[PDB]
Design a protein around this motif. Structure first.
Motif, PDB file in Angstrom:
ATOM      1  N   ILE A   1     -25.060   5.118  25.882  1.00 58.09           N
ATOM      2  CA  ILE A   1     -24.257   5.528  24.738  1.00 58.09           C
ATOM      3  C   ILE A   1     -24.013   4.354  23.797  1.00 58.09           C
ATOM      4  O   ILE A   1     -24.104   3.195  24.200  1.00 58.09           O
ATOM      5  N   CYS A   2     -23.697   4.662  22.545  1.00 59.02           N
ATOM      6  CA  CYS A   2     -23.431   3.631  21.551  1.00 59.02           C
ATOM      7  C   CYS A   2     -22.060   3.851  20.929  1.00 59.02           C
ATOM      8  O   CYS A   2     -21.779   4.925  20.412  1.00 59.02           O
ATOM      9  N   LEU A   3     -21.209   2.832  20.998  1.00 60.23           N
ATOM     10  CA  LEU A   3     -19.858   2.915  20.456  1.00 60.23           C
ATOM     11  C   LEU A   3     -19.565   1.743  19.524  1.00 60.23           C
ATOM     12  O   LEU A   3     -20.210   0.700  19.602  1.00 60.23           O
ATOM     13  N   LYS A   4     -18.582   1.922  18.647  1.00 59.73           N
ATOM     14  CA  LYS A   4     -18.200   0.879  17.702  1.00 59.73           C
ATOM     15  C   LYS A   4     -16.682   0.785  17.572  1.00 59.73           C
ATOM     16  O   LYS A   4     -15.957   1.676  18.019  1.00 59.73           O
TER      17      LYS A   4
ATOM     18  N   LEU B   1     -27.387   8.135  23.074  1.00 59.21           N
ATOM     19  CA  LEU B   1     -28.803   7.798  23.179  1.00 59.21           C
ATOM     20  C   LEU B   1     -29.510   8.715  24.171  1.00 59.21           C
ATOM     21  O   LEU B   1     -28.917   9.159  25.153  1.00 59.21           O
TER      22      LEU B   1
ATOM     23  N   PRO C   1     -28.260  -0.541  30.168  1.00 63.26           N
ATOM     24  CA  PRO C   1     -27.262   0.155  29.350  1.00 63.26           C
ATOM     25  C   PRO C   1     -26.873   1.506  29.940  1.00 63.26           C
ATOM     26  O   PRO C   1     -27.719   2.237  30.453  1.00 63.26           O
ATOM     27  N   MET C   2     -25.585   1.832  29.864  1.00 62.44           N
ATOM     28  CA  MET C   2     -25.086   3.098  30.391  1.00 62.44           C
ATOM     29  C   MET C   2     -25.843   4.276  29.787  1.00 62.44           C
ATOM     30  O   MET C   2     -26.423   5.090  30.506  1.00 62.44           O
TER      31      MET C   2
ATOM     32  N   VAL D   1     -17.429  -8.041  20.826  1.00 60.33           N
ATOM     33  CA  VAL D   1     -17.661  -7.054  21.879  1.00 60.33           C
ATOM     34  C   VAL D   1     -18.483  -7.645  23.014  1.00 60.33           C
ATOM     35  O   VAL D   1     -18.506  -7.108  24.122  1.00 60.33           O
TER      36      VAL D   1
ATOM     37  N   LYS E   1     -20.439  -1.611  12.351  1.00 59.06           N
ATOM     38  CA  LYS E   1     -21.294  -2.038  13.452  1.00 59.06           C
ATOM     39  C   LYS E   1     -21.325  -0.988  14.558  1.00 59.06           C
ATOM     40  O   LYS E   1     -20.521  -0.057  14.568  1.00 59.06           O
ATOM     41  N   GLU E   2     -22.259  -1.150  15.491  1.00 59.34           N
ATOM     42  CA  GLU E   2     -22.404  -0.236  16.602  1.00 59.34           C
ATOM     43  C   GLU E   2     -23.004  -0.960  17.796  1.00 59.34           C
ATOM     44  O   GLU E   2     -23.955  -1.730  17.663  1.00 59.34           O
ATOM     45  N   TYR E   3     -22.426  -0.717  18.955  1.00 58.52           N
ATOM     46  CA  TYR E   3     -22.875  -1.348  20.181  1.00 58.52           C
ATOM     47  C   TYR E   3     -23.380  -0.326  21.181  1.00 58.52           C
ATOM     48  O   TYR E   3     -22.726   0.685  21.433  1.00 58.52           O
ATOM     49  N   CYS E   4     -24.525  -0.614  21.780  1.00 55.07           N
ATOM     50  CA  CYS E   4     -25.084   0.266  22.787  1.00 55.07           C
ATOM     51  C   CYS E   4     -24.891  -0.379  24.146  1.00 55.07           C
ATOM     52  O   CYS E   4     -25.406  -1.464  24.413  1.00 55.07           O
ATOM     53  N   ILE E   5     -24.106   0.274  24.984  1.00 57.96           N
ATOM     54  CA  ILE E   5     -23.793  -0.252  26.299  1.00 57.96           C
ATOM     55  C   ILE E   5     -23.605   0.867  27.318  1.00 57.96           C
ATOM     56  O   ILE E   5     -23.008   0.602  28.381  1.00 57.96           O
TER      57      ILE E   5
END
Lengths: 6, 85
Positions: free
Chosen positions: B16-19, B32, B13-14, B62, A2-6
């Motif tokens: 960037i994409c993290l997992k 991004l 959104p800041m 998350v 999975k991957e989250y964009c925040i």
């Protein structure tokens, strides 16, 4: 996997 | 260990994409375009974030960090480490 964009 | 700090006043959104890998950790899986991180240059795709605003994201949900980050207001402090660029 999975991957989250925040 | 590097302590980056960027102020966020707008609700967005800041940049960037993290997992969370099997080990359970927030790492930018991909940067991004347009984001404040890609434009300003605070992090880089792959960078390992040991802590996110004082909270270490795990394999769990998350949404807790996603919401907090979207509802946050002020200077965000994230603990990241350079994984060799």
């Amino acid at each position: 996997r999975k991957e989250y964009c925040i | 260990v590097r302590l980056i700090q960027f102020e966020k006043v707008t609700e967005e959104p800041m940049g960037i994409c993290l997992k969370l890998n099997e080990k359970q950790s927030c790492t930018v899986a991909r940067i991004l375009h347009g984001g404040m991180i890609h434009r300003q240059g605070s992090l880089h795709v792959g960078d390992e974030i040991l802590e996110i605003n004082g909270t270490n994201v795990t394999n769990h949900s998350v949404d807790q960090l996603q919401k907090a980050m979207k509802e946050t207001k002020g200077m965000i402090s994230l603990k990241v480490i350079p994984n060799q660029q």
